[PDB]
Amino acid sequence: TPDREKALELAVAQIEKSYGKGSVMRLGDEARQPISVIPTGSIALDVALGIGGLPRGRVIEIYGPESSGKTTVALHAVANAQAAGGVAAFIDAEHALDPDYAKKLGVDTDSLLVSQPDTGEQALEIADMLIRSGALDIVVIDSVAALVPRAELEGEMGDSHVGLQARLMSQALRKMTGALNNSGTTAIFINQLRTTGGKALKFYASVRMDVRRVETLKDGTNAVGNRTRVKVVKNKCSPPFKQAEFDILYGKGISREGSLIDMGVDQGLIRKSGAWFTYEGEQLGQGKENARNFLVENADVADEIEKKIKEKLGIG
CATH class of the missing domain: 3.40.50.300 (P-loop containing nucleotide triphosphate hydrolases)
Known part of the structure; x- marks a missing residue:
């Protein structure tokens, strides 16, 4: 547990040095x-x-x-x-x-x-x-x-x-x-x-x-x-x-919009109320097509959702 963690870190660093970041x-x-x-x-x-x-x-x-x-x-x-x-x-x-x-x-x-x-x-x-x-x-x-x-x-x-x-x-x-x-x-x-x-x-x-x-x-x-x-x-x-x-x-x-919703629900930023897509108290649409379309006309919130997902995962 203690003496091993050392040899492993070192091993990984040697590898990372000798062949480049992401080699292991x-x-x-x-x-x-x-x-x-x-x-x-x-x-x-x-x-x-x-x-x-x-x-x-x-x-x-x-x-x-x-x-x-x-x-x-x-x-x-x-x-x-x-x-x-x-x-x-x-x-x-x-x-x-x-x-x-x-x-x-x-x-x-x-x-x-x-x-x-x-x-x-x-x-x-x-x-x-x-x-x-x-x-x-x-x-x-x-x-x-x-x-x-x-x-x-x-x-x-x-x-x-x-x-x-x-x-x-x-x-x-x-x-x-x-x-x-x-x-x-x-x-x-x-x-x-x-x-x-x-x-x-x-x-x-x-x-x-x-x-x-x-x-x-x-x-x-x-x-x-x-x-x-x-x-x-x-x-x-x-x-x-x-x-x-x-x-x-x-x-x-x-469909950027489709991936935004799918990842929204996956991350809990978007809530379902049974076929009803919630976002921060406001409603997006009933079923996925209305959710998708709402985000088209409202590219404002679609950018906020995208920003919100990224931030929550450390991306961009």
């Missing part, structure tokens, strides 16, 4: 809060991440099946990065971006940098060049799987295809990783399930986020969107394995 953690530890972070769009996810959003100057992975919300989550990071006066870049190998959708989430698409690269390496080379500017806050790569190597695209079969894309990622990441730390830019790599250089990205990433749809939500017989679930399977900035749920509405994106 107790899953009950509180997070050390950084100066700035990139909010994700959902307070529930931001809480689950510990530091109130995505880390800066780090590699991030967001993965899941097609149309899980990964991209939606990624674009929300992009919007918030811009909202705070940052500059954003989107390296696109899928050609699937919907800017009108992006726009409604909050993205300043007019001022969003976009490259549609010829090759996997060009994709990463370009990313690198922007990262080394120091003028970017966030860069998103859509996606890991589409980063096909020149040789494969040029028709050569000499390597066979065995490991050339994975080797490409590995190299690029090493080179890229130091660049991000100096610049303070965040690299989001989007990745699918069933990818190619994920073996490399898995270890360089400071945060890996497993995203998927849970249930379809609706008014009656018409699909408004999806309850989305994210597990932070890897986190080097705060205790990992935390998960959060939030709502994505088609054509609207993540």
Whole structure:
């Protein structure tokens, strides 16, 4: 009990020294809060991440099946990065971006940098060049799987295809990783399930986020969107394995308002009087949709609830 606590503290400090802060953690530890972070769009996810959003100057992975919300989550990071006066870049190998959708989430698409690269390496080379500017806050790569190597695209079969894309990622990441730390830019790599250089990205990433749809939500017989679930399977900035749920509405994106209520009830700041959402003596709405909508029209209290949740947990 007494002599052990000493050897353990020391052991942990040596580790923390030799390999960097967050190399070891107790899953009950509180997070050390950084100066700035990139909010994700959902307070529930931001809480689950510990530091109130995505880390800066780090590699991030967001993965899941097609149309899980990964991209939606990624674009929300992009919007918030811009909202705070940052500059954003989107390296696109899928050609699937919907800017009108992006726009409604909050993205300043007019001022969003976009490259549609010829090759996997060009994709990463370009990313690198922007990262080394120091003028970017966030860069998103859509996606890991589409980063096909020149040789494969040029028709050569000499390597066979065995490991050339994975080797490409590995190299690029090493080179890229130091660049991000100096610049303070965040690299989001989007990745699918069933990818190619994920073996490399898995270890360089400071945060890996497993995203998927849970249930379809609706008014009656018409699909408004999806309850989305994210597990932070890897986190080097705060205790990992935390998960959060939030709502994505088609054509609207993540319901900030929905996450505010869900976390409100969870934290006891919001009370239920049987389907009746209370806040500090005043009523928000009957059922979740009226609570959600009340907070839209009344963005005053929605900011107070958000502030109130953060303060109560030590976030932001």
